[PDB]
Symmetry: D3
């Protein structure tokens, strides 16, 4: 019944551009709005938020401030926030506008990367490799304290699915924090059905759950158009099943689909995949 | 049994999709030689001629589809009367109308394994195109245009309780309502992902255990476009080559398949005949080829 | 040493989207600003003009974006700066010429495109305004488009040279023959060679006091520029285009330019965005030696 | 303006040592809208469908198919219609020329092909009849092929112009030099340019009362025509071929034509079938303006 | 579990047989994917010994000469208590690798990860390609000079072999597998059991071996994941299944030598297969995603 | 005159580019069989071994050692009145080829067919890559050990060089070309004059030379025709223009040595570039279409 509020974040910042600012346009090009309207939802496209050691800190901070304020307003209006990226640093703004509305927000971090870096552990200084750490209260003070509170989330309320690119500092933190992580090894061993059932078990006491889906979580064969492709990822079929299972559980209260990069895509295969996954997450069925 | 190969170079509907070249591409991948090497007697009955007609219409190319399907039903009937195995090559999926018209009257309870991205359960009322290749399963169930439903003077050819759809991922609202109303057994990609192809085939064999014959209607578009790019209407997120190969080996071991058609191969979207070669590999597995 | 003022137009309007709103981002991704600075130019990136998303398709959004573009191009010229517009669909030529033409007594236009874009609603099988900007700029078409910025026509038919045409409908052909417009289709380029085509173009426009280059990347062959809104087979090569830009720089006649219709959806690793930057570099004086 | 009805005949023939996929050529050319495009140009078009196709490889089948083709082509010429034959392997030129040559006092032939197809069983490394049709038509080869339709030879060596040759064996080279046959290899196309090659071809065949074009898509470079039976690197470009067809149309000398050797197996989304249709359109008078 | 051994890398740029297949460029392409730097970053001491010069049975003399040099180099690496990692090159190089390795173990196990069984003799081979015969040769079946390389035979026993990924076996190879009782996981068994169970069963089956050699042919993987191989065969093992199998073999601590063979840049796409070979070596040597 | 083929599997510099596999890919396209079929006596001398090993000049010791071995082998071929045909490999091998060749002529001419001028020194090079310096080194400008290879300098004079296909020249290279008066046909001049006129002018310009070396970098061709090169540069010479140029050089009878370098199988499409190199060598040695 909730209206879907779509917010685009054409952010492509860091040591070098990767082409992900074009992600929102490519997702819309795959008919996102019409597909959600056809499913019976009231859809409001709020358009794109304007975007200008720690690369581009001021621009990352300003865009995330605008995103946090817009996501906060959507939640206050009892609407579902759907954010399109854009580099994964936008999770800083999305979680800042969302977490204060829940006593115990869960986060499903669907990505090849853990994005748990600080400037001390990052081989690049890229803020898009730090948003999960920042949201857990670890990192640059201005990013950690966005919107005047911290931390946004607790490590026991995070589940990472699809991880296959973690540096030494990120691995040390996951082990020390006891964070729940399904690397490609456990997806291969358990199967996506059991990974999602266990993820739903794990986050069962959360009063809201945010899905932060990076298209780079999928294998480059299925999602070639991403900012930083990593070999050996989740299939389209496994991702489609996961979105169907999340819809059936009724636990997802916010979501962002990020890192779509038309420069490396093939005739918008990745933009189309993002829309198919959003449709499944919002209740579309094959029968 | 001797294998009787029948080609149907049919590519009809609102627009061509390139599938009339399917039979040629499957033969190019050495279908006849491969079956002969496995020890079968193989008869290539060649291609049935498909009537060309001028280039609005409600049912697209109706006259040419009925005519081609009448020629096919008569040839398939003759093959079965001779106790030979009919292997039909397509061609658009509307050829299932003629294959089932020539086959179903030889059984009291013919089962059908519909291996396809599409349910092909449309009528003109539910079809946004009038494409008869989107209606053959409905026609064979006795639902649709009178001349198509009554082909060979009997209807219906099959009963809904004797159909299993495997790989479905593109169904319109009219097809979904019919599947739910009829109680038809359908394994969408969601069920294949959750159960695994081994369980899907085991359940299919149990479900059709009261049939006296089973027809396999295999649309190469049931496979994912990564494995079968050369199809008339590709749909993302399909069955892998390995799952399809295992399915054919399991169907061979069960010994239930009494007829088969391999359809919708389209050389225009194919990569160096990957899909024609895949069709031959799947036919070899269905007919008993083993890796060891 | 004239400052280059870059304006992005992320416009993708018409019966259906074609992905050309991402053109400005792709051209900038190929380092346009850094390449022009390295050549010794002062470069001012004025950013992207905001465009509203989707008979005359998207008339209100096409008019609104072109109004913003026209007054921005006007200011650049009033400041004695070179306007470089990045597209975006070719309908943005309506705004570029509206902001430029009033500054010249006889503005020349080199329309480098597979399409003539000489349609009206009466000759257009789609109602797409991006297939009408040259006709609109010549004073033929919808009143609100033709009278943008309060004057019409922007240009005269004797001051236009079309180069690379290979997709002209019957209405466009009829107008070309009746107006006596100078057109070098791919047949003339094949027969004369690009050197002769550009020498004849410079001679034909020699009396113009300014010359605008409207370069649609679809003028190039899809093998060289696959990433365009509407690709048409059998186009101009990269080498022919590179030579043309070098000859135009040497003539010193180009006073404004737009590079339009870049489409990342059909591109291969930004080959077309990179090509756009190389052609801009050559037009602005980059030499191989 | 050719006020003649076009008669399209398909020859889905793929014979020889091994199949090459060219039997699918006629279907792929029709898939690229051949009939609709010619009708939209104002021609009356009749699709006569495909002739059924059941040491010298497959001699009986090549003979049977060419006999049916010769009879059909003969009927079209008797009806004062233009025969347009779609292949299929190049051996179909035996039947096309058998049905055509007897209607002319001095039939010219433009053989547009990477191959000369001037082999006999003695000079052929394969025994493929599709590498022998020009020799057979000149009265050199197997008696049943040479005597098809009860007359021989169909054509005289001084009435042949080969364009695009780049795969000639020593027997073919010896015959070309001894006969004095006019051949424009890729070397001569590189040195002269296509305009001059076609102007010279028109001068050379000006005394012929009819001219047959036998266009093998393998004459084009595999970059432009990847979907052919036997691709050979370094061929004619799409633009050179488009210009050549426009110039043949302008001369008004072409009285029959065949477009052969399209092979979907090696093609990319029917680029070669589409190219065949574009070349037919230009040969029949389509202009860009 | 931590292998405190130096890795000795040996390249074998061998591409012999009825026709070249491009696999001599395999070692260069694997090195181009940063093999040495990746193993060094994991904390291993790595010594690149470079490439061995490769100067009816196709090219028998050249196959023998190259395998003789390889066997002597592998033997010296094992005498030095280092881990031999051989890069191919055609699969005939397994003859030299096993000749230099088998004499150092009482019961050497072999995991043959390949679309092909390579169990041919001249009698069962339609080509005479020695690269289709190295497993038979190593079992003591074949041409005397190949079987007796380094003066002993057989190198391995049939009960100590596990073939994983087989999908191209001729009639002579099938007959031998059934008569010898050799353990073979065809793609049909992988589809039915899943790679986890296949590797668990493999480890149990080879538990009495005192060393285990992995002979990994990149053609064992599906051509969609490993297009750049000498002889691609449709319907192979996925990159993910192969990555899981290498991780499981590392956890078992049984692999004592390994060869990665048949990488072919001619059919590859921007070195996807050379990169895949490096990732599989990294997992085999203990790299973990977490 | 016998053709002596020498391979240089050298891929040195700041980063590898895959060109060490160039000689193997060219041979894979049947180079030796094609030249033998044309009636030539052909001797394949094999590949020179390249020593395996932040410095200013990248891999200097290995580049010098390889070029010393190449110069001695090329010198021997010329002393035997044989035609040296060198396969690369990175373009730094021109240092060794010209060192072994230039001393046999009064005034050696050089046709430098390349997207790059390769006229850098360490001071003008943003990488320290010696493969961007071989023409300057051979003109006697650069590092002492490279310039003095084989005990004489310079190998060639600037008035005896013609560059064809240039489209990537840095400021230091442009300044030297203008100050030395060197003859350079950039893509602009090829587009304006046509390849027939370019080669006719080149033949007239080098008519006083008693020998002419062709240094052909496949990157001189457009990446659409030669995708498999070490450093591709958009807007290059077509295969057809290059084929015509080779036929014209054969007819002139002036080419007394040649090298075909920078083939990179990693970026190639089913050896399109290796096959293109063989076709160009065939035309340079007299192959005709009729
Ligand atoms: Cl049809
Ligand atoms: Cl109906
Ligand atoms: Cl079910
Ligand atoms: Cl789907
Ligand atoms: Cl097959
Ligand atoms: Cl003969
Ligand atoms: Cl043997
Ligand atoms: Cl080194
Ligand atoms: Cl220096
Ligand atoms: Cl070759
Ligand atoms: Mg991320
Ligand atoms: Mg990521
Ligand atoms: Mg179907
Ligand atoms: Mg279907
Ligand atoms: Mg335009
Ligand atoms: Mg245009
Ligand atoms: Mg021919
Ligand atoms: Mg030919
Ligand atoms: Mg093997
Ligand atoms: Mg193998
Ligand atoms: Mg160079
Ligand atoms: Mg170079
Ligand atoms: Na792309
Ligand atoms: Na294809
Ligand atoms: Na490749």
């Amino acid at each position: 019944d909730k209206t879907i509020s779509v917010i685009g974040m054409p952010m492509d910042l860091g040591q070098a551009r990767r082409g992900v600012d074009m992600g929102p346009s490519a997702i819309r090009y795959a008919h996102l709005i019409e597909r959600l309207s056809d499913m019976g939802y009231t859809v409001e496209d709020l358009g794109d938020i304007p975007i200008n050691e720690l690369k581009n800190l001021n621009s990352v901070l300003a865009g995330n401030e605008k995103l946090a304020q817009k996501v906060n307003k959507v939640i206050e209006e009892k609407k579902f926030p759907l954010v399109l990226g854009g580099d994964h640093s936008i999770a800083i703004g999305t979680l800042a506008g969302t977490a204060k509305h829940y006593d115990n927000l869960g986060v499903i971090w669907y990505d090849a990367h853990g994005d748990l870096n600080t400037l001390e552990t990052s081989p690049s200084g890229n803020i898009h490799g730090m948003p999960l750490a920042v949201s857990l209260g670890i990192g640059h003070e201005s990013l950690v304290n966005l919107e005047g509170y911290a931390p946004k989330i607790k490590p026991e309320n995070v589940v990472i699915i699809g991880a296959r690119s973690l540096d030494e500092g990120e691995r040390k933190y996951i082990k020390e924090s006891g964070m729940k992580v399904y690397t490609m090894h456990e997806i291969d061993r358990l199967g996506m059905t059991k990974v999602i059932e266990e993820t739903l078990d794990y986050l069962s006491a959360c009063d809201g759950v945010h899905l932060s889906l990076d298209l780079d979580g999928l294998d480059p064969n299925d999602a070639p158009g991403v900012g930083t492709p990593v070999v050996g990822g989740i299939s389209y079929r496994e991702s489609h099943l996961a979105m169907e299972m999340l819809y059936d559980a009724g636990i997802i209260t916010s979501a962002e689909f990020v890192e779509v990069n038309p420069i490396l895509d093939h005739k918008n295969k990745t933009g189309k995949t993002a829309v198919e996954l959003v449709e499944s997450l919002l209740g579309k069925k094959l029968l």
